[PDB]
Write a protein that binds this ligand. Structure first.
Ligand SMILES: O=C(O)c1cc(-c2ccccn2)n[nH]1
Length: 145
């Protein structure tokens, strides 16, 4: 199985599923290197975030446990087609790239912080990540090219 795609056991149904320990993606169907990849993301900062500040709120106060909740929340809406990445990203993302529907433009290694990189490279064109933790906050990372 591709980079970090491991199989495992669903603790609700006991039926097969896959999680990726590099992007924290989890999906039921079996899964499927670039020099550069292009990604958009939705960032939800927290108190412990690098710069607890964003175009949305001058001092972020939400805890980490809560940041995650919010992040899980959008994943459900994205996964269920209730909302798309771009809409939630253009509204909620605590990064200024929200103005650009969360695009961060094309990029290669060394360039971004490592957990974001490792996720960004391990996704394939189309995959969204699960929650990804960096010193900045919590990300949902979609890979576009
Ligand atoms: O604070 C911000 O504005 C911010 C930081 C990031 C970021 C992007 C990639 C990896 C790590 N952090 N994205 N947005």
């Amino acid at each position: 199985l591709p980079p970090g795609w491991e199989k495992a056991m669903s603790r609700s149904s006991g039926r097969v599923y896959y999680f990726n320990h590099i992007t924290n993606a989890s999906q039921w169907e079996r899964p499927s290197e670039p020099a550069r990849v292009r990604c958009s993301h939705l960032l939800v900062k927290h108190s412990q975030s690098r710069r607890p500040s964003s175009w949305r709120q001058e001092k972020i106060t939400r805890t980490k446990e809560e940041a995650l909740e919010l992040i899980n929340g959008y994943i459900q809406k994205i996964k269920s087609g209730e909302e798309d990445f771009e809409s939630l990203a253009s509204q909620f993302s605590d990064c200024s790239s929200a103005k650009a529907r969360g695009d961060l433009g094309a990029f290669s290694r060394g360039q971004m912080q490592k957990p974001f990189e490792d996720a960004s490279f391990a996704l394939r064109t189309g995959e969204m990540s699960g929650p990804v933790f960096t010193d900045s906050g919590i990300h949902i990372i979609l890979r576009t090219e």
